[PDB]
Amino acid sequence: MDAKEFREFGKAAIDYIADYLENIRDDDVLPNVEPGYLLDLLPTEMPEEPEAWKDVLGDISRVIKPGLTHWQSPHMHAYYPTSTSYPSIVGEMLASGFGVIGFSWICSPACTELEVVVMDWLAKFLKLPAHFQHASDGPGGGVIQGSASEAVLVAVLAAREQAVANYRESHPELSESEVRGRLVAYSSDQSNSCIEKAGVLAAMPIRLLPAGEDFVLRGDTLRGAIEEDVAAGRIPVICVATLGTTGTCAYDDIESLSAVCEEFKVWLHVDAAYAGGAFALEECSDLRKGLDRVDSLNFNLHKFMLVNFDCSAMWLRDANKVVDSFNQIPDFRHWQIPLGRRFRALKVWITFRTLGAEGLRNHVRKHIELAKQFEQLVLKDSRFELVAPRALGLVCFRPKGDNEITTQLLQRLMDRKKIYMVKAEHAGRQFLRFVVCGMDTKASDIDFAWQEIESQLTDLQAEQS
Amino acid sequence: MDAKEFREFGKAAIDYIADYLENIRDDDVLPNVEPGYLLDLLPTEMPEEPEAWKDVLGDISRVIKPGLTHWQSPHMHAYYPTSTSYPSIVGEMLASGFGVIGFSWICSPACTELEVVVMDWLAKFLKLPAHFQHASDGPGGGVIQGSASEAVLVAVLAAREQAVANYRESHPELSESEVRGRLVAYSSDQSNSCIEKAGVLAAMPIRLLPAGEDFVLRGDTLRGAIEEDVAAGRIPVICVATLGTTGTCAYDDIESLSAVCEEFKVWLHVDAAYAGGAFALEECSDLRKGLDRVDSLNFNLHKFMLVNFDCSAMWLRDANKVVDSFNQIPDFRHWQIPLGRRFRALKVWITFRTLGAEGLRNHVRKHIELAKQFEQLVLKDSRFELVAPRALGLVCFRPKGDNEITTQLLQRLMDRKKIYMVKAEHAGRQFLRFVVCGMDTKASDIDFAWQEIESQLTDLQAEQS
């Protein structure tokens, strides 16, 4: 394929995407196809001769799209968002065009330096402690990772290596086997499953300690567990706190956990994957309490920043601790698991610049406003109740009565495919999570979701016989 | 930013990329800028109001491009390729437009099913054993990973978990601490650094066993080491063999390593990251010896398949072994380290279809032809010698005489920035690696590189005083 054919293919693809995104709420958010549908539609060998890009592009709509759940839709309410943005799509495409890999400065200087610059930009925008800036004096800095799962994994592995070095150096009569077999780490029982999986991958136990009734993990619980461990001759390694839990968007108490952690020399990592965005807002300032005291923190730009999926930010208070475990312009291949790296800073930069900090703040505030609107609908309706206080873009609620009303209502909504929600459960009680996900989400979209929900409960209950 | 502004931005970006790529050999492949150049050019805060995309796009050329090493250039000879392709850039952009995440089937069915289909396509094209196909009876199948570092890490971690389960279940009097502290794994001393780093991350020793003079690791060496270990009460876990070593593109002997590995119940993973592409060629059939006997294998599509960077394929003989360690349509989040996944199959599919298997084969054969041309130049010149036999797109060679002639020649080439090569070293002897990397690479490009090299040695030697 030569350049002209590329200009034409690419231009038609730009048109295709613009028109997919502008018109997205006209399509069912959930797909109607059965597992295996695609396998049946597509050949079993790659074509021997080259196919025309018009035919391929037409196939996108014919056989791919029907098998998509549309994440970019205002009607997607199921999980924390990916919602991308136009500039982000252009930036990623540009990056793909350069096709450069940043495993060292000379592999391309701009890859690395632009990462340094946008991570500092983001740290200022999120009102993060100064020491998280590269430009700052000190070893602190941020790095773009693939996902929050990877950032959590990095922090856990780094803490495990620093622990087994600080200990074994302190007590060389002990073998690595013994020390490593004595390591223990902690988190909330409300933490994301990526914490657990990191425990498995790190070969280190992660105790999921009970959060309160309010889904908040607290310093006294952690202290208790750590004393229980230390007393037993075990070595406390890292605590992974969560700001913005998956279930209710609960916030662990970082001040008390922090005091405890400094006490016992425990690494404290904060998974802010979703709620990190709200750090940018003065009215959310409470969410930043204790941040000047933690070791590392992650936030997913795709979740709140309108940078398309991939793109997790991780700031370290002291990067040496990672670099020493895995092995002035930073050498980022040492701040990460893999060796090569994509040029992810490009799309981030393009998005920050074309949106502006004002646009970013407005975007977060708009999600908060839409969720507030939804909550008002839940509150006004005598047949529904709130299960948790509203937080950011998330409202947890259920129809009053038995869990099975929740289950049946959700099944009806699933089958209709007009909006997408998932069920959750806490202390035996099942509920529905409504999250505002849209690139384009408007008040009328919230009204649409509520009408759909409210309707389906009306019919559900009008059928009971 | 609304849709019209996106159509215009995106279309201009398509033009920008097409014209960057068609005209790329007109620019120096290596950048002339100093570390810190970009930090100095760019503001220290994100703009508060939104910037115009024309201004941003113009800045790409002004401040980004000067800080790029141009990987897509025919004049990039330094490392195994990333070379992307036009259709791949369009596909990735399309994927970004959907902005979907495949952490489960329903998160989008097409994400997963298309992955199944292109991994099978690729397995047939690479003449891989049938059992590596999803469609095949049996638990075998492939999965797209982020990089070869990740695929190697996955295989090592999976092998470590299966080992500590199979053992501890066999001898429950032993604690996990003891078993885990007794684990040992193996590789070549010529293996990629990602093997070593995987050892560190996996908390498992990886013995880099001496390859022969020919840079090939052999079954007898592995047997020796494993017997040395077993005798000492240690548990052999995994051997990571390499087809296509970084230094010389050497090939470990997979048949003997295989026999040894089956003997001791050792997981055998093959890192084929680069040379995997040549599996598609009948004249390369020897490279596939023993493949029906290994556990898992990785190949980087970006290296030989013209799919842009990211995109490593990993096939498992039995996927249960990974799935059981980390935790019919496969559930791919279990075949991997992270939880969410990008829709990477889309660009792969678009590239396979628009290129054709014929185009892919021609591409690999063309690299082989260009390297053969280069080697002929080295051989005809009385002042240069071959350090290793030519393999695929790689020729290792040096100017005759002391290592310092190699060093000085490389420094001259670096300073000129017309072509990019790196130095290597084996058994005290330093040499130059010439790899053909180009999307567009032509015979005249090979002639260009040789003229540059040959010239610079002539001047180097004509200066000595």
Written as one string, the DSSP assignment of B317-357 is S-THHHHHH------GGGSSSSSS---THHHHHHHHHHHHH
Say whether A89 and B10 touch across the interface (CB within 8 A).
yes
Query: Which residues in A lie closer than 8 A to residue B322 (C-beta atoms)?
Result: none
3-state SS string over B132-159? HCCCCCCCCEEEEECCHHHHHHHHHHHH
Where do the domains of chain B lie? 100-342, 361-463
Q: Is the dihedral of CA B38, B40, B41, B47 positive or negative?
A: positive
Phi, psi of B251 (to 5 degrees): -120, 115
What residues contact residue B140 under an 8 Å CB cut-off, 6+ apart? B131, B132, B133, B134, B315, B316, B317, B318, B319
Say whether A201 and B337 touch across the interface (CB within 8 A).
yes
Say whether A48 and B97 touch across the interface (CB within 8 A).
no
Closest CA to B453 of B394, B397, B401, B402: B397
Tokens of A55: 């035919």
CA distance B321 to chain A (A): 14
- Contact yes or no for A452/A413 (Cβ under 8 A): yes
∠ CA(A99), CA(A101), CA(A107), 5° rounding? 120
Say whether A15 and B7 touch across the interface (CB within 8 A).
yes
Q: How many CB atoms lie within 10 A of CB B70?
A: 23
Query: Which residues in A lie closer than 8 A to residue B193 (C-beta atoms)?
Result: 339
Say whether A101 and B309 touch across the interface (CB within 8 A).
yes
CATH superfamily, with its number, for domain B361-463: Aspartate Aminotransferase, domain 1 (3.90.1150.10)
3-class DSSP assignment, residue A48: coil
3-class DSSP assignment, residue B80: coil
Tokens of A234: 């075990």
Burial string for B348-358 (b: 16+ CB within 10 Å, else e) reads bbbbbbbbbbe
What is residue A61's DSSP assignment?
A: I
Query: Which residues in B lie closer than 8 A to residue A324 (C-beta atoms)?
Result: none
Closest CA to B395 of B437, B337, B353: B437
Comparing CB atoms, the residue among A7, A68, A193 nearest residue B110 is A68
Q: Which of B353, B355, B410, B414 to mutate to test the interface with A (most CBs of A within 10 A)?
A: B353
What residues contact residue A401 under an 8 Å CB cut-off, 6+ apart? none
CA distance A20 to chain B (A): 8
Pairing outcome for strands B422-426 and B429-435? antiparallel
Comparing CB atoms, the residue among B11, B83, B98 nearest residue A11 is B11
Say whether A108 and B33 touch across the interface (CB within 8 A).
no
Say whether A35 and B329 touch across the interface (CB within 8 A).
yes
∠ CA(A7), CA(A12), CA(A13), 5° rounding? 95
Say whether A357 and B48 touch across the interface (CB within 8 A).
yes
- Contact yes or no for A155/A145 (Cβ under 8 A): no
- Contact yes or no for B135/A45 (Cβ under 8 A): no
Closest CA to A460 of A417, A425, A411, A423: A411
The whole-angstrom separation of Cα A383 and Cα B318 is 51
Sheet of A235-242: strand order equals: A141-145, A312-316, A296-300, A267-271, A235-242, A183-188, A206-209
What is residue A129's DSSP assignment?
A: -
Q: What is the DSSP string of B196-252?
A: HHHHHHHT--EEEEPP-TTS---HHHHHHHHHHHHHTT-EEEEEEEEBS-TTT--B-
The whole-angstrom separation of Cα A218 and Cα A216 is 6
Q: What is the DSSP string of A343-402?
A: -THHHHHHHHHHHHHHHHHHHHHHHHHHHHHHHHHHHH-TTEEESS--BTTEEEEEESS-
3-class DSSP assignment, residue A327: coil
Tokens of A449: 């979701």
Q: What is the DSSP string of B354-396?
A: HHHHHHHHHHHHHHHHHHHHHHHHHHH-TTEEESS--BTTEEE
Q: Which of A98, A121, A334, A350 to mutate to test the interface with B (most CBs of B within 10 A)?
A: A98
The whole-angstrom separation of Cα B406 and Cα B423 is 8
Tokens of B149: 């570092």
The whole-angstrom separation of Cα A21 and Cα A70 is 10
Residue type, B397: F
- Contact yes or no for A93/B93 (Cβ under 8 A): yes
- What distances in angstroms separate CA A93 from CA A97, A99, B13, B74, B79, one per listed residue? 6, 10, 8, 21, 23
3-class DSSP assignment, residue A305: coil
H-helix or E-strand spanning residue A78: none
- With the CA atoms of A198, A201, A204 and A207 taken in that order, what torsion angle do they form, in degrees rounded to the nearest 10? 40
Comparing CB atoms, the residue among A7, A30, A94 nearest residue B60 is A94
Comparing CB atoms, the residue among B39, B97, B153 nearest residue A113 is B39
Strand locations in A221-263 (E): 235-242
- Contact yes or no for A271/A109 (Cβ under 8 A): no
Least CA distance to A107: which residue of chain B?
Answer: B69
A317-324 long-range contacts, Cβ below 8 Å, gap at least 24? Answer: A317/A131, A317/A132, A317/A140, A318/A138, A318/A139, A318/A140, A319/A139, A319/A140, A319/A141, A319/A143, A320/A139, A321/A158, A321/A162, A321/A295, A322/A154, A322/A158, A324/A161, A324/A162, A324/A165
Q: What is the DSSP string of A434-465?
A: EE---SS--HHHHHHHHHHHHHHHHHHHHH--
The whole-angstrom separation of Cα A164 and Cα A170 is 10
Say whether B71 and A309 touch across the interface (CB within 8 A).
no
- Contact yes or no for B245/B190 (Cβ under 8 A): yes
- What distances in angstroms separate CA A212 from CA A348, A361, A398, A412, one per listed residue? 37, 31, 21, 33
What residues contact residue A286 under an 8 Å CB cut-off, 6+ apart? none
**Given the structure tokens 């502004």, which residue do they identify?**
B5
H-helix or E-strand spanning residue A29: none
Q: Which fold has domain A100-342?
A: Aspartate Aminotransferase; domain 2 (3.40.640)
- Contact yes or no for B421/B395 (Cβ under 8 A): no
Comparing CB atoms, the residue among A14, A146, A353 nearest residue B146 is A146
Count CA within 13 A, CB hemisphere, residue A139.
13
Say whether A94 and B16 touch across the interface (CB within 8 A).
yes
Breaks, C-N > 2.5 A, in chain B lie after 327
Residue type, A68: L
H-helix or E-strand spanning residue B284: none
Q: How many CB atoms lie within 10 A of CB B359?
A: 17
What residues contact residue B172 under an 8 Å CB cut-off, 6+ apart? none
Query: Which residues in A lie closer than 8 A to residue B358 (C-beta atoms)?
Result: 48-50
Say whether B46 and A194 touch across the interface (CB within 8 A).
no
H-helix or E-strand spanning residue B60: none
- Contact yes or no for B124/B362 (Cβ under 8 A): no
What residues contact residue B253 under an 8 Å CB cut-off, 6+ apart? B216, B217, B218, B219
H helices of A265-314, where? 301-304
What is residue A51's DSSP assignment?
A: P
Q: How many CB atoms lie within 10 A of CB B247?
A: 19
Query: Which residues in B lie closer than 8 A to residue A63 (C-beta atoms)?
Result: 110
H-helix or E-strand spanning residue B84: none
Count CA within 13 A, CB hemisphere, residue B424.
21
Residue type, B120: D
Pairing outcome for strands A183-188 and A235-242? parallel
CA distance A380 to chain B (A): 32
Note the residue count of chain A: 465
Least CA distance to B194: which residue of chain A?
Answer: A339
Note the residue count of chain B: 465
Burial of A444 (C-beta count, 10 Å sphere; 0-12/13-18/19+): exposed
Residue type, A109: P
The whole-angstrom separation of Cα B308 and Cα A95 is 10
H helices of B381-465, where? 403-416, 443-463
H-helix or E-strand spanning residue B397: strand B394-399
What is residue B63's DSSP assignment?
A: I
3-class DSSP assignment, residue B434: strand
- Contact yes or no for B397/B422 (Cβ under 8 A): no
Comparing CB atoms, the residue among B48, B101, B175 nearest residue A82 is B101
Least CA distance to B51: which residue of chain A?
Answer: A354
What is residue A124's DSSP assignment?
A: H
Q: Is the dihedral of CA A130, A133, A137, A138 positive or negative?
A: positive
Say whether A100 and B71 touch across the interface (CB within 8 A).
yes
Q: What is the DSSP string of B151-192?
A: HHHHHHHHHHHHHHHHHHTT-TTS-HHHHHHHEEEEEETTS-
Q: Which of B46, B59, B124, B133 to mutate to test the interface with A (most CBs of A within 10 A)?
A: B46
CA distance A356 to chain B (A): 4
What is residue A69's DSSP assignment?
A: -
The whole-angstrom separation of Cα A148 and Cα A157 is 14
Count CA within 13 A, CB hemisphere, residue B199.
20
Q: What are residue A187's DSSP bridge partners?
A: A208, A240
Say whether A194 and B338 touch across the interface (CB within 8 A).
yes
Q: Which of A25, A64, A147 to mutate to test the interface with B (most CBs of B within 10 A)?
A: A64
Closest CA to A100 of B83, B66, B31, B151: B83
The whole-angstrom separation of Cα B315 and Cα A211 is 41
H-helix or E-strand spanning residue B430: strand B429-435
Say whether B94 and A16 touch across the interface (CB within 8 A).
yes
Burial string for A42-74 (b: 16+ CB within 10 Å, else e) reads beeebeeebbebeebbebbeebbbbbbbbbbbb
Pairing outcome for strands A296-300 and A312-316? antiparallel
Residue type, B17: I
Comparing CB atoms, the residue among A69, A302, A329 nearest residue B106 is A69
Comparing CB atoms, the residue among A38, A107, A149 nearest residue B338 is A149
Tokens of A351: 């998005």
Q: What are residue B398's DSSP bridge partners?
A: B385
What is residue B52's DSSP assignment?
A: P
Tokens of B136: 């095949």
Q: What are residue B269's DSSP bridge partners?
A: B240, B296
Comparing CB atoms, the residue among B3, B37, B177 nearest residue A181 is B177
The whole-angstrom separation of Cα A156 and Cα A198 is 7
Say whether B96 and A105 touch across the interface (CB within 8 A).
no
Tokens of B107: 């998160």
Topology alike, domains B100-342 and B361-463: no
Q: How many CB atoms lie within 10 A of CB B251?
A: 21
- What distances in angstroms separate CA B366 from CA A101, B29, B177, B275, B392, one per listed residue? 24, 21, 52, 14, 10
Query: Which residues in B lie closer than 8 A to residue A44 (C-beta atoms)?
Result: 120-121, 135
The whole-angstrom separation of Cα A6 and Cα B9 is 16
A192 flagged as catalytic: yes
Phi, psi of B243 (to 5 degrees): -105, 120
Least CA distance to B356: which residue of chain A?
Answer: A50
H-helix or E-strand spanning residue A314: strand A312-316
- With the CA atoms of B445, B448, B454 and B458 taken in that order, what torsion angle do they form, in degrees rounded to the nearest 10? -170
Say whether B353 and A47 touch across the interface (CB within 8 A).
yes
Query: Which residues in B lie closer than 8 A to residue A29 (C-beta atoms)?
Result: none
The one catalytic residue in A192, A298, A300, A308 is A192
Closest CA to A448 of A459, A438, A463: A438
3-class DSSP assignment, residue A316: strand
The whole-angstrom separation of Cα A143 and Cα A132 is 10
Q: Phi/psi class of residue B315: alpha, beta or left (left: φ > 0; alpha: ψ in -120 to 50)?
A: beta
What residues contact residue A164 under an 8 Å CB cut-off, 6+ apart? A176, A179, A180, A183
What residues contact residue B334 under an 8 Å CB cut-off, 6+ apart? B322, B323, B326, B327
Burial of B178 (C-beta count, 10 Å sphere; 0-12/13-18/19+): middle
The whole-angstrom separation of Cα B54 and Cα B8 is 10
CA distance A39 to chain B (A): 6
- Contact yes or no for B346/B94 (Cβ under 8 A): yes
Closest CA to B147 of B95, B198, B111: B198
Query: Which residues in B lie closer than 8 A to residue A356 (C-beta atoms)?
Result: 46-51
Burial of B26 (C-beta count, 10 Å sphere; 0-12/13-18/19+): exposed
For chains A and B, what is the number of CB pairs under 8 angstroms? Answer: 394
The one catalytic residue in B166, B192, B327, B362 is B192
Phi, psi of A35 (to 5 degrees): -55, 130
Q: What method was applied to determine this entry?
A: X-ray
